[PDB]
């Protein structure tokens, strides 16, 4: 029986242009006090082909947690457009948010990312190479995929 569970996650700043940093709001419930600091990660899958184009955004630690429920807001920087292959630079992809405790991952949440040209002529026929000044990022918050793992806590 897991102790810490997420109760609601709400995405902020959507839709928005490509260069805006990511915003999230996470609340979670706790049964009994935790001994060590928590850890969170955000992973952006640059290319749908394989995992060689993964860009890590940021990783933070959460202070000591007493019993009860808490809320906080997570912020991370924009991804580097230079490392993304030009084939995957338009279409759909996946953004991963994961949590680790005592060096063990125990819950993963992911979203579908919609990257499309705002100008309809570029959406009907896009340019030969990207223009990141005209792209817009959309996150499908209506269908969040989650998966939880059983780990050791004591």
């Amino acid at each position: 029986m897991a102790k810490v569970q997420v109760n609601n996650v709400v995405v902020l700043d959507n839709p928005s242009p490509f260069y805006n940093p990511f915003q999230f709001e996470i609340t979670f419930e706790c049964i009994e006090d935790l001994s060590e600091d928590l850890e969170w990660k955000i992973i952006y899958v640059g290319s749908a082909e394989s995992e060689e184009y993964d860009q890590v955004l940021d990783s933070v630690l959460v202070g000591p947690v007493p019993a009860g429920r808490h809320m906080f807001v997570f912020q991370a920087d924009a991804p580097n457009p230079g490392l993304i292959p030009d084939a995957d630079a338009v279409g759909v992809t996946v953004v991963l948010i994961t949590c680790t405790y005592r060096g063990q991952e125990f819950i993963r949440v992911g979203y579908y990312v919609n990257n499309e040209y705002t100008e309809t002529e570029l959406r009907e026929n896009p340019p030969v190479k990207p223009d990141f000044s005209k792209l817009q990022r959309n996150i499908l918050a209506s269908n969040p995929r989650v998966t939880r793992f059983h780990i050791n806590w004591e």
Binding site: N7, N20, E51, E105, G110, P144
Partner: protein, 540 residues
């Protein structure tokens, strides 16, 4: 323990001599260390992992979008309040500290691996890939630099072409594209390049019970992915009432039949080319559980585990336990024809593994305690109290009959998985010791370098070795078992095993690709050092 290592280091004996000894003055000299033969392999392994610990890891015009659901006046008050308060280095061969000792150690390691003395092959391969994947920071300690580590890893990895040529496209692509091996052996990288371009009667109430059961499942698969969901809290009441009604109506057999049929039907299997590959990322296993993850129920198999854990009735378990045993016994003896293309083998194996998993989970549930029996004098009492009841399935006789008539590939997988969910005391019993020693004897004989002895396909040997190497690292089984213990042509000859089946049987194999991708994803020393800390906000 280190005397043999010192003797081999200072050019006293030959590697082949000690290899043959473990598996005219040289024999007399080696016989002087007779009592230390059994401890050589674990001591060498531990010494290797210890020396690696020096290098391997320890263990403004902004714009927003809304989301629906003079400064002189303040100076006086502020004054009043304040008064009241008052770069990565390249690798090349030339900066190596030594060559003879490293070459000897690498050759010994490779010889030990090739002759199948180590417990697990893939664990050692993952350790070689870790030693190949580091970048920063007896007579004398080893590994003063990254060069030394890279040279040692490349020397060992040179002699294992055959295993490296049988994985999927991705790992071969990244291994042939590697930027470091070009400095140490161009021939090996050309070889793996050519390989890459070369690879291609019932009552009326039963209707109500069935309708309720079908309604329950239609609640799970459409709401188990929303955050905050709980199984027992949301469904711990209806199931118990329905099961009590079933027990009152004494109709467990038909419900068990329906349950087994549904479990077998659904748990197998229910731009598209890009979507299918993209979807694989979300369903990935634990990112830190490898290379020997504990048994788990991924996918849709987890629903039945929670269902059984929630019901907890006496009557239901017995019926399920009998029906699964009957289905397993019937399916083992199917006479699969051997000769076009045959596909039924995959279905049979995938069914047998799942059935063995579920039976093993149900059968041993009462005894799965947390602790071993601490002493050797009180323990025999529990051993006597436990060994009397016969097992639910005559597994030893089934294994003995299977091996007597070839059929090796069709029996070992599901039998090996069945023992996975055993409790902590099983290995101490008198009965299962024969099964374990038979498995040891089978494991020893399989050698990848010999094919004239008998006729077994290479992929079959690989699958058998990989499966047998995962059982012995389970925490429940004690580690000292390995070292202290010291006709017709048929199914085993035809090439029925494919790459897809091998990768589906052992998902932990693919973690080698993850370690290669981690190297190239880390294209610079991004955001190293201290990291931001945030204090949580609490509400009541």
């Amino acid at each position: 323990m280190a005397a043999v290592l010192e003797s081999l280091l200072r050019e006293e004996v030959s590697v082949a001599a000690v290899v043959r000894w473990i598996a005219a003055g040289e024999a007399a000299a080696l016989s002087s260390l007779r009592a230390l033969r059994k401890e050589f392999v674990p001591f060498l392994l531990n010494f290797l992992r210890e020396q690696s610990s020096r290098v391997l890891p320890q263990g403004p015009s902004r714009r927003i979008n809304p989301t629906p659901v003079s400064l002189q006046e303040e100076r006086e008050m502020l004054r009043k309040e304040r008064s009241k308060q008052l770069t990565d280095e390249p690798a090349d061969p030339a900066r190596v500290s030594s060559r003879q000792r490293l070459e000897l150690v690498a050759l010994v390691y490779s010889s030990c691996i090739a002759e199948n003395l180590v417990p697990n092959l893939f664990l050692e391969l993952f350790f070689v890939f870790q030693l190949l994947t580091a970048r920063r920071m007896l007579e004398s300690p080893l590994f003063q630099s990254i060069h030394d580590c890279v040279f040692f890893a490349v020397q060992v990895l040179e002699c294992h072409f055959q295993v490296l040529s049988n994985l999927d496209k991705g790992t071969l692509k990244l291994l042939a594209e590697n930027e470091r091996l070009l400095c140490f052996s161009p021939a090996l990288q050309g070889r793996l390049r050519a390989a890459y371009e070369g690879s291609v009667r019932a009552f009326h109430t039963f209707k109500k019970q069935r309708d309720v059961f079908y309604e329950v499942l239609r609640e799970w698969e459409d709401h188990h992915e929303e955050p905050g969901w709980d199984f027992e809290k949301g469904l711990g009441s209806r199931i118990r009432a329905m099961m009590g009604q079933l027990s009152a109506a004494c109709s467990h057999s038909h419900f068990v039949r329906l349950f087994q049929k549904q479990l077998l039907q659904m748990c197998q299997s229910p731009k598209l080319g890009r979507l299918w590959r993209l979807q694989e990322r979300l369903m990935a296993p634990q990112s830190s559980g490898g290379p020997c993850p504990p048994p788990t129920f991924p996918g849709c198999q987890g629903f039945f585990r929670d269902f059984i854990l929630s019901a907890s009735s006496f009557q239901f378990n017995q019926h399920l336990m009998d029906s699964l045993s009957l289905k397993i016994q019937e399916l083992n003896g199917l006479a699969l024809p051997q000769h076009g293309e045959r596909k039924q083998f995959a279905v049979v194996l995938l069914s047998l593994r799942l059935l063995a998993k579920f039976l093993g989970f149900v059968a041993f549930l009462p005894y799965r305690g947390p602790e071993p029996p601490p002493t050797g004098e009180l323990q025999d009492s529990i051993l006597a109290l436990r060994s009397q009841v016969p097992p639910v399935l005559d597994v030893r006789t089934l294994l003995q009959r299977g091996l007597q008539a070839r059929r090796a590939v069709l029996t070992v997988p599901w039998l090996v998985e069945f023992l996975s969910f055993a409790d902590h005391v099983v290995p101490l019993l008198e009965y299962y010791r024969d099964i374990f020693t038979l498995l040891l004897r089978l494991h020893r004989s399989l050698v990848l370098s010999q094919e004239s002895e008998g006729k077994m396909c290479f992929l079959n040997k690989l699958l058998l070795l990989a499966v047998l190497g995962w059982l012995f690292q389970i925490p429940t089984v004690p580690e000292d078992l390995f070292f202290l213990e010291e006709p017709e042509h048929g199914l085993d000859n035809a090439p029925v095993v494919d790459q897809q089946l091998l990768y589906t049987c052992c998902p932990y194999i693919g973690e080698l690709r993850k370690l290669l991708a981690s190297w190239v994803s880390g294209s610079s020393g991004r955001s190293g050092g201290f990291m931001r800390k945030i204090t949580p906000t609490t509400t009541t």
